[PDB]
Design a protein around this ligand. Structure first.
Ligand SMILES: NC(=O)C1=CN([C@@H]2O[C@H](COP(=O)(O)OP(=O)(O)OC[C@H]3O[C@@H](n4cnc5c(N)ncnc54)[C@H](O)[C@@H]3O)[C@@H](O)[C@H]2O)C=CC1
Ligand SMILES: NC(=O)C1=CN([C@@H]2O[C@H](COP(=O)(O)OP(=O)(O)OC[C@H]3O[C@@H](n4cnc5c(N)ncnc54)[C@H](O)[C@@H]3O)[C@@H](O)[C@H]2O)C=CC1
Lengths: 427, 425
């Protein structure tokens, strides 16, 4: 951070990321509050975590108890004595009940207001710690097994660059993978744009988690794509995702390798043809739409519709901060990454009726060749303009993706998560 | 100094409202295809120069786009005409409510428009702004419920609202007698009105016809009177957090306005900033009671006893902090998020009653609170598409829009007044 003096800004924390074997948090886990979530959670987490009743690894506050605004007082009461003591890369997570689904307008106003609290707290925490807010459906059984994959993601190192965000967990029950640390056992994952960078790193994480990977990219990038299929011990496939036959070409490679079925499609492939709209041509527009919006929509509709992905399936789409906030010279790109959010939202119910979830991740600043292509100052500032005071890592994106792919993340659909370090930019 | 030079700024002097001035600086071009282009042309022919110099406004009807492949319309309409848009120009994309589209394809496409409008907002020059308005696919072709929004957007009043998203329902609208005197013969309770913003809301309201009831605490008795006199409404000393609060206003509505008011503005607000690990009960509880508990207690009270009824208008003051959060403000942002909470939550109940409740989240506004160090002041000021802080009028203008009698199909809305501030969620 070579402009720490120029911007009045702290040296970054080295963010603890996932390592197999290591405990998930670096301290004890406090689970406070009141409502329908504290008891069952204390219960589901007994074994794998380190429950009170030194340094706090995690702090979970149960807000579902809070039925009027006068009760918000709780957040204060619970958090004020314990922040003094949160560890390196701590994890604060507040849990509430889906505000639209509340039993009174009064309840709704308090549960809604939670985000103000969490997004603000995210701005006060030190040494790499983060905040998250999760809403659970008031029609979830009290065991609340549907909430588990999410708590486990946040209450760990994998969520290392996921800060200040809001999770939205449905009503369905969930079933834990035999092994949480190999959650993707014998799953077939399709990952587009997997030659290098974020796509490639998705494949890795997927493989690490148990999946067999179909690495898709174009002929231009074989060698780099070969090196990837190899490393995850999966299978390469040369394909332009915008071409008539693409759906046919994936289905068949599946038929020849995986019994014609898949569990996970990751729409990662993408291009950028930046230019101001006053200077934008038809070609710089169209190309970006084809790859970035038209294709992922086609592959989802294609592969679900032809039965390649069925029950228990998972689609994760690659969005962007640009699609939420906008960006100079990216009206194409940001239409497409906003459309991606639209695919996620538009298809969630339909796919829900088919036992399939669909979610998007919207990366912020990630070290890739592409951030590396930006004038160093503009680049250095961008990298540093977040609560976590640093650029994100391609692993951090893939993690959030892998959390969506989880067989126990079945109750989580239509969600949009930024992997952004709590970047300041937003809508 | 060096960083500033490195990065590359020319804030335009923003045109504001002036009685008499035309509402644009140039002619209005209405393009695109769909159920909005023909009616909008016809509604606006009188007061605007439609295309048979440079463009004062551009409006692209996007309701016509039903699949992603047709997004290309945006590019075909805007690219050619962009280079010709004037100082403080205006760009507005009208679309179909995504959640209510007739296919998932449409939904994808109409949802996609926000990425476009927010980015375009970031490329416009010379103080010009972009806006996205979605209209219920259930509105009648006449589209009468849309006008108030279009007329506010396509005017100088909306000078500091940039890059936003407006949500118009199905209901029909009757226009006021005088578009320049919209609030004529309306009674408006404006809390926190002694100084700054609240005091300016009261002005803009007078300008617009309203009989204002300027409200405040006793300690600010002096400044209230000045305000009350300036606008030609009457004053009321009361602390909004008093258990008698509702009853006192109600009493006053009898004494003066037939036990009746049409608009409520929950402007009164306070701060008490503290890192949460130093937060004491006073600082938590004070703000909470003033910023969240109070506003609700007034709204629910004044609709409950019938003081505000059919045709009513509650407008609450959120904040950027409530959307994006902010260091030292867990208490404060909890409240302003709760204000959105009040707005989203009370909207269907009030809809059924003939009342619209909406919210406004100011960005950075030149005021007496903003007492902030020149290091933080200079950055929050300039970190938005428009390269400056906003004037209080900019905020009150937006409130005045909601408050229109013609804004009956506008409810549940949270509109930031931030000249597209960079910070958000
Ligand atoms: N910092 C970043 O790099 C960020 C990236 N984005 C998005 O994340 C995703 C991955 O990021 P990057 O690694 O930078 O993506 P990228 O632009 O480097 O491309 C990903 C891969 O897609 C492949 N590709 C392009 N067109 C294809 C096609 N028609 N068929 C098959 N493959 C094709 C390319 O060969 C490339 O290897 C992209 O959607 C990108 O837009 C999102 C946020 C930030
Ligand atoms: N940049 C800005 O100015 C921003 C302002 N805010 C909001 O705008 C609103 C007012 O704006 P400002 O003029 O900057 O604040 P302010 O503090 O200058 O407004 C003062 C008014 O609040 C009144 N007040 C405080 N407690 C009261 C009570 N209990 N009962 C009756 N009146 C009471 C004071 O008497 C005074 O009339 C506040 O709600 C604030 O949260 C929103 C975004 C940022």
């Amino acid at each position: 951070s070579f402009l720490a003096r120029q911007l009045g800004v702290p040296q970054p924390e080295t963010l603890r990321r996932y390592r197999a074997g290591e405990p998930p948090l670096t301290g004890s886990l406090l689970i406070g509050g009141a409502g329908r979530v504290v008891e069952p959670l204390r219960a589901a987490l007994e074994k794998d975590y380190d429950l009170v009743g030194d340094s706090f690894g995690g702090l979970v506050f149960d807000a579902t108890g809070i039925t009027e605004p006068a009760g918000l007082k709780g957040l204060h009461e619970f958090f004020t004595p314990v922040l003094r003591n949160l560890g390196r890369c701590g994890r604060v997570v507040v849990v509430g009940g889906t505000p639209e689904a509340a039993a009174s307008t009064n309840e709704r106003i308090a549960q809604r207001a939670l985000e103000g609290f969490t997004r603000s707290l995210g701005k006060e925490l030190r040494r790499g710690a983060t905040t998250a807010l999760v809403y659970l459906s008031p029609d979830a059984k009290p065991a609340a097994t549907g909430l588990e994959s999410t708590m486990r993601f946040l209450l760990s190192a994998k969520s290392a660059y996921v800060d200040g965000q809001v999770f939205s967990v449905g009503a369905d029950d969930s079933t834990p993978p035999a092994d949480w640390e190999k959650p993707l056992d014998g799953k077939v994952a399709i990952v587009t744009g997997a030659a290098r960078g974020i796509g490639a790193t998705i494949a890795e994480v997927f493989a690490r988690d148990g999946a067999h990977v179909v690495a898709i990219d174009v002929e231009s990038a074989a060698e780099n794509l070969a090196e990837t299929a190899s490393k995850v011990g999966g299978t390469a496939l040369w394909l332009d995702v915008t071409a008539d036959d693409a759906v046919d070409k994936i289905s068949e490679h599946l038929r020849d390798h995986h019994g014609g079925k898949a569990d996970i499609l990751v729409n990662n492939a993408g291009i950028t043809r930046d230019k101001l709209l006053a200077n934008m041509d038809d070609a710089r527009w169209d190309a970006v739409l084809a790859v970035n919006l038209l294709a992922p929509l086609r592959l989802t509709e294609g592969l679900v519709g032809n039965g390649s992905i069925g029950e228990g399936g998972r689609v994760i789409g690659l969005s962007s901060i640009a699609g939420i906030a906008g960006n100079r010279g990216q009206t194409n790109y940001a239409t497409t990454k906003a459309g991606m959010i639209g695919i996620t939202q538009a298809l969630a119910p339909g796919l829900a009726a088919k036992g399939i979830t669909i979610n998007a991740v919207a990366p912020g600043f990630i070290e890739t060749q592409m951030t590396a292509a930006i004038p160093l100052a503009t680049r250095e500032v961008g990298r540093r303009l977040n609560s976590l005071l640093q650029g994100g890592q391609p692993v951090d994106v893939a993690e959030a993706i892998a959390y969506f792919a989880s067989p126990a993340s079945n109750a989580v659909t239509g969600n949009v998560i930024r992997v952004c370090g709590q970047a300041m930019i937003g809508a």
